[PDB]
Amino acid sequence: ANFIEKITYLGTPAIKAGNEHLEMIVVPEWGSNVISLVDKTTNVQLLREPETAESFHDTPTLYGIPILFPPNRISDGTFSFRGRTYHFDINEKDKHNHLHGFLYHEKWNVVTTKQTDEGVIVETEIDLSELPHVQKQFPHHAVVRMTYTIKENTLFKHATVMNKGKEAFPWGIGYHTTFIFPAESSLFSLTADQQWELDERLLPTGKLMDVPYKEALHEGMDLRHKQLDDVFLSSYQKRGGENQAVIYHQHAHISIIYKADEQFKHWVVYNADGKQGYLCPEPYTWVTNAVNLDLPSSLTGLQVLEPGEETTAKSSITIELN
Ligand SMILES: OC[C@H]1O[C@H](O[C@H]2O[C@H](CO)[C@@H](O)[C@H](O)[C@H]2O)[C@H](O)[C@@H](O)[C@@H]1O
Numbered sequence: 202a203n204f205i206e207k208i209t210y211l212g213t214p215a216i217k218a219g220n221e222h223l224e225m226i227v228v229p230e231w232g233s234n235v236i237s238l239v240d241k242t243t244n245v246q247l248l249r250e251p252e253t254a255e256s257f258h259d260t261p262t263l264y265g266i267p268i269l270f271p272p273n274r275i276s277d278g279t280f281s282f283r284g285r286t287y288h289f290d291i292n293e294k295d296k297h298n299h300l301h302g303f304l305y306h307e308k309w310n311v312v313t314t315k316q317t318d319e320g321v322i323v324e325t326e327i328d329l330s331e332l333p334h335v336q337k338q339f340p341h342h343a344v345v346r347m348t349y350t351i352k353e354n355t356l357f358k359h360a361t362v363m364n365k366g367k368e369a370f371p372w373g374i375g376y377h378t379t380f381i382f383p384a385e386s387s388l389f390s391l392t393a394d395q396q397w398e399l400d401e402r403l404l405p406t407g408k409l410m411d412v413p414y415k416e417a418l419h420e421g422m423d424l425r426h427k428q429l430d431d432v433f434l435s436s437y438q439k440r441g442g443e444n445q446a447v448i449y450h451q452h453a454h455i456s457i458i459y460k461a462d463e464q465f466k467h468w469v470v471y472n473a474d475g476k477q478g479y480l481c482p483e484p485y486t487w488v489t490n491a492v493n494l495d496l497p498s499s500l501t502g503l504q505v506l507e508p509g510e511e512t513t514a515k516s517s518i519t520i521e522l523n
């Protein structure tokens with residue numbers, strides 16, 4: 202049994218959808234942000250929700266599931282692709298970067314909803330050629346379609362990126378997924394062995410380094426007194442196995458299994474100062490500043506769509522009760 206219901210989320214239109222296990226709320230106007238994810242059996246919210254519409258706008262990448270296209274930093278907002286140079290708004294002024302892409306602060310359209318025994322689908326979409334200011338920065342006919350499916354106890358979360366233009370473009374995608382993370386009763390684990398070393402501007406130098414506490418990181422570890430803003434290299438590339446973040450709420454015995462396919466080669470993990478009760482295990486298909494690295498694509502995970510092509514990048518959130 203499953204349902205869709207149109208609602209108002211803090212004065213914005215929104216869509217609630219779900220089954221007997223999980224409910225989502227997606228707000229198309231807020232960059233198609235999946236702002237709420239609720240476990241119906243235990244009745245607990247899993248995502249960091251905003252108090253007021255205003256405080257959501259203050260920081261639109263620190264609530265629910267913000268879409269980062271492309272993710273994280275480009276230095277000086279400048280890169281070159283196939284001879285051609287680009288200039289993106291430098292919205293991060295101290296570090297002199299462009300930060301977090303085009304689509305998190307924009308109006309997305311609902312393409313369609315669909316319901317079968319296979320669970321409930323909501324689809325959203327944005328055509329970048331319909332946003333004049335983005336075209337100044339990035340004159341390409343990129344179209345992004347999100348497909349959200351709740352089925353059994355899982356939210357499947359698929360990004361289809363399409364080139365409907367006449368020139369090839371590099372692209373990567375990331376999510377700023379913000380989970381409620383209580384430092385004293387929450388354990389965290391990630392399939393990662395190495396991380397990207399960063400300069401003062403949170404930009405990759407090019408070098409990789411062993412994660413000292415990698416064992417603990419594999420098994421599940423508390424984050425008490427540990428400030429993270431780290432760009433990890435998914436272990437799957439070298440070792441196979443899983444590609445996932447896991448969060449474990451000790452009180453209610455809830456496991457949140459955040460899976461992602463082979464295209465997601467990096468996870469940025471962010472908890473601000475560690476005293477804010479949240480955590481952002483952010484899977485990216487490409488490393489920070491990927492566009493500006495003279496490094497193999499199988500490492501940076503940089504991708505290219507030629508005219509007429511499309512790719513789908515798959516991730517899921519699984520709630521397990523144990
Ligand atoms: O912004 C275009 C520049 O990209 C490279 O340099 C930046 O990115 C590096 C990788 O993160 C940083 O280490 C470096 O400090 C940044 O300036 C490229 O090396 C430059 O030639 C480009 O101008």
Ligand SMILES: OC[C@H]1O[C@H](O[C@H]2[C@H](O)[C@@H](O)[C@@H](O)O[C@@H]2CO)[C@H](O)[C@@H](O)[C@@H]1O
Pocket residue numbers: 262263273293294403430469471473483
């Ligand atoms: O202007 C800098 C901005 O970012 C810092 O934290 C970032 C983090 O570095 C990124 O990797 C990103 O994914 O998460 C945060 C922004 O969403 C600072 O901690 C933050 O206060 C500041 O606004």
